[PDB]
Design a protein around this ligand. Sequence first.
Ligand SMILES: *[C@@H]1O[C@H](CO)[C@@H](O)[C@H](O)[C@H]1NC(C)=O
Ligand SMILES: *[C@@H]1O[C@H](CO)[C@@H](O)[C@H](O)[C@H]1NC(C)=O
Ligand SMILES: *[C@@H]1O[C@H](CO)[C@@H](O)[C@H](O)[C@H]1NC(C)=O
Ligand SMILES: *[C@@H]1O[C@H](CO)[C@@H](O)[C@H](O)[C@H]1NC(C)=O
Ligand SMILES: *[C@@H]1O[C@H](CO)[C@@H](O)[C@H](O)[C@H]1NC(C)=O
Ligand SMILES: *[C@@H]1O[C@H](CO)[C@@H](O)[C@H](O)[C@H]1NC(C)=O
Ligand SMILES: *[C@@H]1O[C@H](CO)[C@@H](O)[C@H](O)[C@H]1NC(C)=O
Ligand SMILES: *[C@@H]1O[C@H](CO)[C@@H](O)[C@H](O)[C@H]1NC(C)=O
Ligand SMILES: *[C@@H]1O[C@H](CO)[C@@H](O)[C@H](O)[C@H]1NC(C)=O
Ligand SMILES: *[C@@H]1O[C@H](CO)[C@@H](O)[C@H](O)[C@H]1NC(C)=O
Ligand SMILES: *[C@@H]1O[C@H](CO)[C@@H](O)[C@H](O)[C@H]1NC(C)=O
Ligand SMILES: *[C@@H]1O[C@H](CO)[C@@H](O)[C@H](O)[C@H]1NC(C)=O
Ligand SMILES: *[C@@H]1O[C@H](CO)[C@@H](O)[C@H](O)[C@H]1NC(C)=O
Ligand SMILES: *[C@@H]1O[C@H](CO)[C@@H](O)[C@H](O)[C@H]1NC(C)=O
Lengths: 198, 149, 222, 137, 37, 49, 50
Amino acid sequence: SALGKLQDVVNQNAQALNTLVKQLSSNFGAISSVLNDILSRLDPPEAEVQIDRLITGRLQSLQTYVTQQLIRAAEIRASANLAATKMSECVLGQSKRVDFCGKGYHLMSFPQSAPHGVVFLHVTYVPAQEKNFTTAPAICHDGKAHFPREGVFVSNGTHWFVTQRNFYEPQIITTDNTFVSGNCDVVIGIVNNTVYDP
Amino acid sequence: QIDRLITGRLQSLQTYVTQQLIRAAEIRASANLAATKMSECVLGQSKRVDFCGKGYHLMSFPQSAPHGVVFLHVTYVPAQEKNFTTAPAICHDGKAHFPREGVFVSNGTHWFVTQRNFYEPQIITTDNTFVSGNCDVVIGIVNNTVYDP
Amino acid sequence: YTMSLGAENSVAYSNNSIAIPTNFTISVTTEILPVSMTKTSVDCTMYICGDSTECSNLLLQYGSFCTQLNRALTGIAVEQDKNTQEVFAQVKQIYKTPPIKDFGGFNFSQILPDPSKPSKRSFIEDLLFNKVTLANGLTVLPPLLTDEMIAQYTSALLAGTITSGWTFGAGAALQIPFAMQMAYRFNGIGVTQNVLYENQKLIANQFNSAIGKIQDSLSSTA
Amino acid sequence: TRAGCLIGAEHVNNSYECDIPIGAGICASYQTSQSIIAYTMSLGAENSVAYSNNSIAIPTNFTISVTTEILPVSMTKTSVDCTMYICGDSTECSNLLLQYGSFCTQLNRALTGIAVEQDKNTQEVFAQVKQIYKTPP
Amino acid sequence: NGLTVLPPLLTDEMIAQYTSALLAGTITSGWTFGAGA
Amino acid sequence: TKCTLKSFTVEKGIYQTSNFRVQPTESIVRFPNITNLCPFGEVFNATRF
Amino acid sequence: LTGTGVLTESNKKFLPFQQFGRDIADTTDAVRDPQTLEILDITPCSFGGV
Ligand SMILES: *[C@@H]1O[C@H](CO)[C@@H](O)[C@H](O)[C@H]1NC(C)=O
Ligand SMILES: *[C@@H]1O[C@H](CO)[C@@H](O)[C@H](O)[C@H]1NC(C)=O
Ligand SMILES: *[C@@H]1O[C@H](CO)[C@@H](O)[C@H](O)[C@H]1NC(C)=O
Ligand SMILES: *[C@@H]1O[C@H](CO)[C@@H](O)[C@H](O)[C@H]1NC(C)=O
Ligand SMILES: *[C@@H]1O[C@H](CO)[C@@H](O)[C@H](O)[C@H]1NC(C)=O
Ligand SMILES: *[C@@H]1O[C@H](CO)[C@@H](O)[C@H](O)[C@H]1NC(C)=O
Ligand SMILES: *[C@@H]1O[C@H](CO)[C@@H](O)[C@H](O)[C@H]1NC(C)=O
Ligand SMILES: *[C@@H]1O[C@H](CO)[C@@H](O)[C@H](O)[C@H]1NC(C)=O
Ligand SMILES: *[C@@H]1O[C@H](CO)[C@@H](O)[C@H](O)[C@H]1NC(C)=O
Ligand SMILES: *[C@@H]1O[C@H](CO)[C@@H](O)[C@H](O)[C@H]1NC(C)=O
Ligand SMILES: *[C@@H]1O[C@H](CO)[C@@H](O)[C@H](O)[C@H]1NC(C)=O
Ligand SMILES: *[C@@H]1O[C@H](CO)[C@@H](O)[C@H](O)[C@H]1NC(C)=O
Ligand SMILES: *[C@@H]1O[C@H](CO)[C@@H](O)[C@H](O)[C@H]1NC(C)=O
Ligand SMILES: *[C@@H]1O[C@H](CO)[C@@H](O)[C@H](O)[C@H]1NC(C)=O
């Protein structure tokens, strides 16, 4: 399955450690790669040169290792703050941000533990089965333009309806769900039909 | 001499790769900021003030650039403000009346309800007026005629 | 000079006194975020070996430092590819450019790539690409994302934005009239939909004037 | 490619999803006779939408689907003992350590800060609320 | 050679318990577990 | 901790201390148990050299 | 071979032409006692986890 992103952390940590021990395997230009040999056949006025060479080489190797692991941990901090953001409004609320917390309209996210990671269950609203329809910006009734209080003014053939944009639930045009503002001449594209009263 | 020159070159190389590596980390921080601006400015609307444009953000048009992104941050910027007179609620028939939307706003003597960011006055009517409680618990109420349709 | 903290604006908290904007302006501004950086890589043999006769003896003792540094640089290069990948391919649904006709009075010839030329480069994109002046074992790796595919991704994002609204994120590309999408994005700042539709010509003229100003300002060579 | 000449894989006029790169908008993968293949970039599935005057679309159904998003939040803690690294099992351990051990002391302080940051990563992602709740029936 | 791996403070059992508490707050209390009771 | 941080006051927390604890006081020598004399008399007294 | 560290008993078998051993270089873990021909290991004086 798609668990390679979690495996890469352990794989690269193992690569850092075994590359480090292979660095420590080197001799760094000294006469031997071990400290005990050069401390067994060299007087200190000649031994301290090789000691300095080996210690500087091992400390440079440790410097490269701590640099790699350290800014890698900074990148893991960036991803951790991203995940804690996904803890912040996907688990403890609802996110209006598109595509950040799941493909589609986000509902929830169920946290699940993982080895050195967090695995998300981003359940999402995904619409399908689209249909063509005809819309207008407003309806003029009694010389007054009528705007959608909610949803989209959606007509199929003759009956004019208002309905929300994310689901096809048709309701008849009625003044309770219809908002009126001004006359119907300034706006282009207005149609006209009977707006009912309850 | 080979050891000295190779260690000098490798020290120069490790300084170079540290500078490039955390410079790329800062570039990644800016890249995540831009991808955040790619996530609710062009894929939606951001209610965050000043984050995605000086004003109230409407849209954003992504335009390509050499090793970067330049945004087209279209924004709402209001101006031309006038002084008016306001009061938290309205009292009628011994009951406090709260704004369903907008601010209770008066000029002269007539009292109107209107949204905060545009001077579009509506007459006070029970359809856009919300009623809650009596007239005495709140401080600072004006009283007038609330109309019924 | 001393710092300019700002212009002094005298305003009053006086209660029982409110202010409402009678008239509004629409102004577009540029925010510039460098999202990618040039890829770099080093060859170990041409760096520390060079033209040395004992290239083998130099390699096994000291080339492992360069091996670590090249691994770090390769990781940086992969990170730089992923930067532009996640900023430009959040949605991987590629679109044709819609026919440029009747965009509610908003005149989108400058920002959309014209079909007259077979590159997906926009006019403002052409100005941006023209105005930016570019510039021993060090090799500059080219980026994975070429300029043509980045331009195509921006074209697809623009085409989804001005036609489908924001539904292209949820995978159905439901087409919207641009006046309706503009009204629905005015609905998010607390102002009612009547303001746009009552003054659509003024909004279109303001946006066209802003586009002209941002074209003239971004063509002064400084 | 614009990066350079690629020998060893065959190009194809079709387009497939990229997993590993080449460097010039080309990618390679394992695909079928089976061998290594090289393909151009997958810009994606092509969707034909028609912007039209006074027309709207509305979904009849909707689908609910859960997707896996995986974010590595923590990384394995490591620490280096200075004496056992630079001194090892060798004589004159005191003389080796007072001159060069503080480099390792700085690096170990950096590694301890990294370890504290790694604990704080899982602490702030998993204990934003510190009120434990028993499992409901 | 001196490379020691420090175990994390937050063990797997308590991470599982925190995850269970978050799920219990999410599916029974809703999102009020963040603020209040 | 005061020695490994080179200060007389340290704060609260955790500190990995360096190994300054034990100093050995004994020495052992082990060699192969062959005690013949090497022919340095043949080499350094070479009459025909 | 001079050094400071504790020694214990190991069970791995050497080749006839091999007398020393270093599982990882710069550690010098393996050695044979000349007197008893007992295969042993060489470890540092104390574990570093304090
Ligand atoms: C009707 O819907 C189909 C869906 O495939 C689309 O291709 C077509 O352009 C639509 N017609 C109009 C007039 O929008
Ligand atoms: C509109 O659609 C409904 C349901 O899809 C259908 O029953 C009806 O005949 C259509 N036309 C009119 C004029 O309502
Ligand atoms: C849509 O386009 C047609 C062009 O044939 C035009 O006549 C009509 O007025 C447009 N409707 C609008 C802009 O609402
Ligand atoms: C509807 O509008 C058209 C054009 O504006 C007009 O000719 C027609 O008389 C109107 N119908 C009604 C019932 O108002
Ligand atoms: C009226 O508006 C002006 C705007 O410049 C402001 O300076 C003044 O304080 C306002 N008066 C009151 C009483 O709020
Ligand atoms: C309020 O302002 C309007 C115009 O803004 C003006 O006609 C009117 O006389 C003013 N006073 C009242 C009481 O409406
Ligand atoms: C309005 O309130 C004032 C003071 O509370 C009161 O004197 C006045 O009679 C009230 N007017 C009406 C019409 O209720
Ligand atoms: C603010 O309200 C109080 C009553 O709560 C009133 O006494 C005071 O005069 C008001 N301030 C102004 C600026 O009129
Ligand atoms: C509002 O501002 C626009 C932009 O300049 C202007 O054209 C229009 O005349 C103004 N309207 C009023 C009532 O001042
Ligand atoms: C507006 O678009 C038209 C194409 O419909 C184009 O001819 C014109 O040049 C554009 N305006 C500007 C200022 O570029
Ligand atoms: C693949 O594209 C090349 C480019 O011209 C063409 O010559 C060749 O016939 C194509 N192969 C197939 C199987 O269509
Ligand atoms: C919507 O999809 C569901 C699930 O497949 C199906 O049962 C239902 O019949 C569909 N609705 C319509 C109107 O086709
Ligand atoms: C090696 O010599 C020592 C010295 O007397 C003796 O004690 C030991 O037994 C000898 N070992 C063998 C294997 O001969
Ligand atoms: C070599 O010969 C001289 C004279 O006979 C003698 O003094 C010396 O000890 C000899 N060297 C050795 C190593 O026995």
